[PDB]
């Protein structure tokens, strides 16, 4: 099933931010961040899991602080963390913080 990745990451330079899982098979993407810094995160993926031997839960999700795909980049982090779900679903949630303002809340969803 899908992953539903999903929540808001504030305190960034405007642009294009790398977004990864430490790790094999982890490049989600980009989030993008308007002029208030501010970059919500509302993706689906069915690369990555919440569950089996390649689970995602207790690895590190991180954002690359300098906009753009340029090198020397500082890191905002978090640990992927188990979250209560309800009946058939598993949940988690990465609170990431980096330097300054940066910091924010990503939650990860998956039917089970």
């Given at each position: 099933a899908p992953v539903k990745v999903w929540?808001?990451?504030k305190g960034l330079t405007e642009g294009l931010h790398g977004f990864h899982v430490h790790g094999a098979g982890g490049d989600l993407g980009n989030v993008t961040?308007?002029?208030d810094g501010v970059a919500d995160v509302?993706?689906?993926?069915?690369?990555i899991s919440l569950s089996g031997?390649?689970?995602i839960i207790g690895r590190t999700l991180?954002?690359?602080?300098?906009?753009?795909?340029?090198?020397?980049?500082?890191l905002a982090s978090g640990?992927?963390?188990?979250?209560?779900?309800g009946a058939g679903a598993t949940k988690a949630v990465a609170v990431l913080k980096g330097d300054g303002p940066?910091?924010?809340?990503?939650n990860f969803e998956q039917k089970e």
């Open positions: 929540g808001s990451i961040a308007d002029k509302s993706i689906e993926d069915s690369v031997d390649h689970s991180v954002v690359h602080e300098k906009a753009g795909a340029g090198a020397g980049s500082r640990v992927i963390g188990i979250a209560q779900a940066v910091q924010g809340i990503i």
